[PDB]
Chain length 292, copies 4
C-alpha cells in the first residue's frame, strides 16, 4: 500500500545500540491496531544512516517477520553510487517487501541527467516498485518535477516522497505524471496541505506516536473532508514541528519511550541523547496532541 | 604536510571505471614536478562517494606507493556513523599517510554537540592528524566556529578545510584556535581571499590541471605578495568557476584528459559524462589560463 | 469586491512617461467586459514606486471616473512611515474607492510589533477597508501569520494579499482569522494552488492580458472545480512566469501594447525598455495562452 | 572625505519625534573629538526612511552648521525613481556637503541595466561626488560588481558602501575599478575583514557609541596592523551584532541615550521603543566594550 498514513518507523535500540525485537514487535502491533497503511523500515527515521548493511537487512527481515502479513513493509534502499544502489536492491527481491523507498544520491550532487540515469538503472534491475525520495536539506540535491516526469514513465517507478515542504511541487509533478503515480508528503508540518493540493498520503514521523489520528486525518483528506482533517492536524501541529526540535529521530524516539512504546530512546552516534530543554518541548507537544 | 597548495586529486579511471595506475603515476609525478605541497587521496574530487572501502584503500595505498616519499599524502576518511568513521580511519594507521581529511556526517544532520562527539571520538582512536572538513552544501550539516574551537583543543585535530565560501569564517575560527591550527580553503574561487584573511593554503580542485600556477599563487600569498598572487588568480578564475559547471569531478576529469594528464575521463554513476556545452566552457577556461 | 480575479492594473503612459487616459479607458472597458472583480489602481504593477503623490491621486481619480461605477476600485496606499501612510490614506476617504491595498513598510525592516502598530494606526484613522500586502522580496520584511491574526481583529483590516509564494501561509493565516477575512494570492504562478488551499482570489498581473480566462479560472476555483481551473492555469503558466522575465511591469506593459490594449509600453526610470530576448519570451507565452 | 571610520549618524529626536539640536551638537562634537573621519547625515541609521524631504534637508543643513567645517558631511540621498533622485540630489548642490550616499532603488527591483541608467543619470545632473550603496536586504536589489565597474567609469561616481556582508565582493569590485575608487564596508561585524581584503573604511553604526575605538581600529587597519586592530574589534564585536538585535536604529539610539550622548531615544513609527530584553542585551554589549 502506498496511500494514507505510512509510518517512517523508528529502529528501537537497547542501551547498547542494538535492535530491540521486543520494542519493534510492540510498534508493529500498535501500527496494525491503529490503521497505519504501511511501514517504511530503515528509512531516515529508522537510522538508515548508521546501520551497516547486515543490520539494515536484519531489521527489514525482522519487521517483515513480526508484521507477519498484517501490514505492508517498504524498505529504505537508497545509495549515492548507482552500482551499489542496484546491488543493495537485489538483496531485497523476493524478501516480501512491497516496495522500496530510494533517496536521491547524497553528497555528490549529481545533475538531473545523472539522477535520471541513477533511478532508471535501479528500476531496470528489479521487479520491485520504487518510490523516489527527494529531501534536498539532507542530500544537497533537488530532484526537480521535470525529471520526476521522465522517471514516472519507467514502469516500476510508482511514486515520490516529496520532502521539500515546497507545496508548489505537488501540481508541477501531478501534471507531468499519470493519475496512478503516487504523491506522498515527506514533511509532516505541510502534509495536510500537500494532500489538499492532490497528494495521496504521507510518509510520517508523527505517525510513530499518533498513528490513529494520522490514519483518520489522511482518510478524511482522501475523502475531501479537509476541515475535519484540519482539526486533527491542528492538535498534531506542535508535534509535527517539535519532533524536529533536535535532529530526527532524537525527539521521536524519546516520545516513543515516554509513551511506553519502546524500552529505551537510545540512538547511534553522531545522534546524541535528547537535551532537557528538548524533552520539555516534546512533552508539551505530546500533551497538546492529547497523548499525555 | 598542511600549508600551500594541496591537490584534491582525481581518481583517474579506465573505461571500466577502475583506477588507472599509469594515469595516477603521471598525475603524481606532475605534482611533484609542479611544486604541489600535498595530495588529498580519495576525497570528494577523488570520488570518495562511489568507491567502496576496499577500492578506496587500494587507491590511497597506490598513491602512497607512487608518491614514493616525494610528496605527503592525506586520505579522505569521512563517515556519517561514528563507530564506522573510527574503523574506517583505523585502517590507515601505520599506512604512511600523514593525515586524514574527515568530513562532517552527511544526511543525518547532527547537532553541534553530536559533531563534537563524533570528531572527538575519531581523534581519540587514532594517532593520525585529523583535518576537519566543512562543506554544508554537500552534507546538510554546518560545523560552526564555536564547535571548531572546541575540537581544536583535541591534540590530533590539527586544522580545517572550510569549503563554505563564507570568508567571515576565517577570523571567527582563527580567534578561537591556537596559532598552529591550520586553516585551509576548500573553495577555489575564494581561496586567495581566504589566505589574504589569514588562511594557510587551499585543498584545490583547480590544482589538478594548474598545479604550478596554484603552487606559485599560494607561495606569493604566504609571503604577503597579494597583488602579484591576484594576477595568477585572475588567470585561473574562470577555471575556479567552470570546473563546477557540471558536478565535480566531471569537469576537472575532462580537463585532465584534454591536457593529456590521464588516459580517460570516465567516472562512476551517478556522475555522468560532460555535456558538449560543458566541454566548450571548460576548454575556454583552460585557454584563458594559458594551458591550452 | 475582494474575491475572484482582481487586476493589479498597469498605469499606461505616453512616450513622455505621462498617464494616457485613452489607454486607461480601454483597459477599464476591457476589465468590465471580461468579468474582472475589481481593479487595484496604482499598486506595484501600476508603478506606485515612481509616481509622485499628485500623479498617484490623479490616476486613482481618473480610474474611478472612467470606471463610472461599473467595477470597484481599490487604491494602492502603502508607506514606510506610519504618519505618512495615515496622511496619504486620509486623502482617499470619500473618494469612491472601496478599499486600500497597503504594503508592509519597505527598507526600514520593522519588527512584528512595529508592523502591528503601523497597520493598526492606519486602520484607526479611516473608515476604508484595508487589505494588508506582504511581499518580502520587495520590502525586506515579512509579515508573519501570528501578526496577521492580531491585525485581523481590527474591524477595518479585512484581508491580505500574500505575495510570498509560500503556500503554507494560507492555512497558518486562515486558522487564526475569522471566516470573513479574505485571503488573496499576490503570486500568479501559485495562485490556483493558493485558492485550492482556501484562498479567495488573486491580485493578478496576468489578468492584465488574460482577464476572461483569469475570471473563469477563479470562479471555477471558488466552486471547487480545480481540475477545470487547472486546464486554464496550465495555458497561462508561461505568462505567469514570463511576465516576470524582466522586472514587473516591463513584460506586462509590452504585452498590453502588443495586444493593442495600450498605445505605448513606456515606463519610468529605473524601469527600462524590454530587451529583444524578453520580447521573444513574452510573445511565446502569449501564444501559449492563446492570445496571439 | 571617504576613508577611515565614517559614522552613520542617528537623527536624535525629542519626545515628539523632531530633531533635537542640542543632542545633534553633542554628537557632532563627540565625533570631532573622537577622530571620526566623516558623518553620513540622514542615511539609514539617521531615519532617512521616515523623515520627509524638508525634514531631511533641515537635518543635513543643521549637521553642516554644527560641524562648522571641522568634519566632512555626506548626505543620504536615495530615491527609487530616477527623475526624483535627480531633484532630491540637486537640492544639495552648493550646500557644503562633500558627497552623497545614494541608495539603490528599493521595492521596484530594477535590472542591472536599470541600475546603471539610474546612477549614471544622477551623476550627470550634479557635480557632487556619489557613493553607491548596496544593501539588498533592505532594497530587494543587488548591485553586482560588473555593474559597479561600469559605474565607476562615471567621473563623479567615486565609491561604494557594500553592506551585503559578503566579503568576496571586495576583490571582485576592486579588480574592475581604478585604485582611487573607494570601497567602504556597510556591515560593522565584517568591516575589519573587509579592510583586510583591501577595503578603505566603514560607514558604521557602531561608531555612534564607540567613535574613538572605531577611528583607532580603522587607522591600525590602514597601516597594516591587523592583529592590533582585531583586539579592538573583539571588544566591539558584541556591539557590532547586538546593535541589530532589534531593527536599526532602535538599539543604537537607546545606547546613545544610555551613554548620555542624546536626550531621548525616541524614533518614528514603524520603529518601536526597544524591548526590555533588547535593552539588557545592548547594555551587556556596551559593558563588554568598556563603555559602561
Ligand atoms: K511508472
Ligand atoms: K589540536
Ligand atoms: K477585521
Ligand atoms: K569615477
Amino acid at each position: 500500500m502506498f496511500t494514507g498514513s505510512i509510518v517512517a518507523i523508528v529502529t528501537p535500540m537497547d542501551e547498547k545500540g542494538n535492535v530491540c525485537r521486543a520494542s519493534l514487535k510492540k510498534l508493529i502491533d500498535y501500527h496494525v491496531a491503529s490503521g497505519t497503511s504501511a511501514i517504511v523500515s530503515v528509512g531516515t527515521t529508522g537510522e538508515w544512516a548508521t546501520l551497516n548493511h547486515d543490520e539494515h537487512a536484519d531489521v527489514v527481515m525482522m519487521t517483515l517477520d513480526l508484521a507477519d502479513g498484517r501490514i505492508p513493509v517498504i524498505a529504505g534502499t537508497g545509495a549515492n553510487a548507482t552500482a551499489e544502489a542496484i546491488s543493495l536492491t537485489q538483496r531485497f527481491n523476493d524478501s516480501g517487501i512491497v516496495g522500496c523507498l530510494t533517496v536521491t544520491p547524497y553528497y555528490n550532487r549529481p545533475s538531473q541527467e545523472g539522477l535520471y540515469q541513477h533511478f532508471k538503472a535501479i528500476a531496470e534491475h528489479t521487479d520491485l516498485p520504487q518510490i523516489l525520495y527527494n529531501v534536498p536539506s539532507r542530500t544537497g540535491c533537488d530532484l526537480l518535477p521535470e525529471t520526476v516526469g521522465r522517471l514516472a514513465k519507467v514502469k516500476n517507478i510508482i511514486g515520490i516522497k516529496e520532502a521539500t515542504g515546497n507545496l508548489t511541487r505537488v501540481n508541477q509533478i501531478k501534471e507531468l505524471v499519470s493519475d496512478d503515480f503516487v504523491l506522498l508528503s515527506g514533511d509532516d508540518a505541510s502534509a495536510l496541505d500537500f494532500m489538499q493540493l492532490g497528494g495521496h498520503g504521507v510518509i510520517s514521523v508523527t505517525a510513530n506516536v499518533a498513528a490513529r489520528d494520522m490514519a483518520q486525518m489522511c482518510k478524511l483528506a482522501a475523502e475531501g473532508h479537509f476541515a475535519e482533517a484540519r482539526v486533527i492536524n491542528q492538535r498534531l501541529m506542535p508535534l509535527h514541528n517539535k519532533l524536529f526540535v533536535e535532529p530526527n529521530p532524537i525527539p521521536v524516539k524519546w516520545a516513543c519511550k515516554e509513551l511506553g512504546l519502546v524500552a529505551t530512546d537510545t540512538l547511534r552516534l553522531p545522534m546524541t541523547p535528547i537535551t532537557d530543554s528538548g524533552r520539555e518541548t516534546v512533552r508539551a507537544a505530546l500533551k497538546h496532541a492529547g497523548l499525555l
